[PDB]
Design a binder for this molecule. Structure first.
Ligand SMILES: N#Cc1ccc(CCO)cc1
Length: 282
């Protein structure tokens, strides 16, 4: 079926939970043996969210190459994304090692450091120009260059220096700051505006490594971001945009990382964002 009218048909019939459970039943199951090794317990935020072995990002290190991060490669759309958990106190250096080694231009953050009164990820970037951060375990230096605070999101320019080689690179930090503590946003308008700002920066384009996108677990809000982007790109590329099937795209993405889209409300919100975004594109 088309999307917008399939949407109204699920709303009127109140069957979002049944649609979402079908997705969960059909989703791929692949091994995640490296994630479950005992030496990696303090590298995982949640015991039930792990990268598959076949698609995990490897650190360029011979001691321990593990990070909770996955490469999502979308062949027809010609987009790649790295989805990862919010960094932990003992993985902030690994996080920036990955950004460096994979040649990423942008980092997309969809959570606040504290939500619901608890910590959802480490404070992994510097908050003042004159107070830089050094990660001694991976030999990297990180400096805040500039910051632009808007009503729904903040953009930061950061300098990442490889202290072994003295090479430097400019990284863009796109921070969506207004996702509610419970539920999903009422309108997709500010999320779409944010997606378009990431796109306009070059961070999603083939001349750079894959964008790094995270929330707390790296599957819920993060899944929404890449699902919406990929569906809108396919609607631009194809002769028949109504042939884009959002449930099939999501199942394809779940071949590369488990659990993408965590609730039926997140699924409905993804539909809403693609539907509204397709009208603005033209
Ligand atoms: N890119 C891309 C892409 C991903 C999924 C699908 C659905 C396959 O039946 C089609 C295209």
């Amino acid at each position: 079926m088309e999307m917008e009218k399939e949407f109204e048909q699920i709303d009127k019939s109140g069957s979002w939970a049944a649609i979402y459970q079908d997705i969960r039943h059909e989703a791929s199951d692949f091994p995640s043996r490296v994630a479950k090794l005992p030496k990696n317990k303090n590298r995982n935020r949640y015991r039930d969210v792990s990268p598959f072995d076949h698609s995990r990002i490897k650190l360029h290190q011979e001691d321990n190459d593990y990070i909770n991060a996955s490469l999502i490669k979308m062949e027809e759309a010609q987009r790649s994304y790295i989805l990862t958990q919010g960094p932990l106190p003992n993985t902030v250096g690994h996080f920036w090692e990955m950004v460096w080694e994979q040649k990423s231009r942008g980092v997309v953050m969809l959570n606040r450091v504290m939500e619901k009164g608890s910590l959802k990820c480490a404070q992994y970037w510097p908050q003042k120009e004159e107070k830089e951060m050094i990660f001694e375990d991976t030999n990297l230096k990180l400096t805040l260059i500039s910051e632009d605070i808007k009503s729904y999101y903040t953009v930061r320019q950061l300098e990442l220096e490889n202290l072994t080689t003295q090479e430097t690179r400019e990284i863009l930090h796109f921070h969506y700051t207004t996702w509610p503590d419970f539920g999903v946003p009422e309108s997709p308008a500010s999320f779409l505006n944010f997606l378009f700002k990431v796109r306009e920066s070059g961070s999603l384009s083939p001349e750079h490594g894959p964008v790094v996108v995270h929330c707390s677990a790296g599957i819920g809000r993060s899944g929404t971001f890449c699902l919406a982007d990929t569906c809108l790109l396919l609607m631009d590329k194809r002769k028949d945009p109504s042939s884009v099937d959002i449930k099939k795209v999501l199942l394809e993405m779940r071949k590369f990382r488990m659990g993408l889209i965590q609730t039926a409300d997140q699924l409905r919100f993804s539909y809403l964002a693609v539907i509204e975004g397709a009208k603005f594109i033209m």
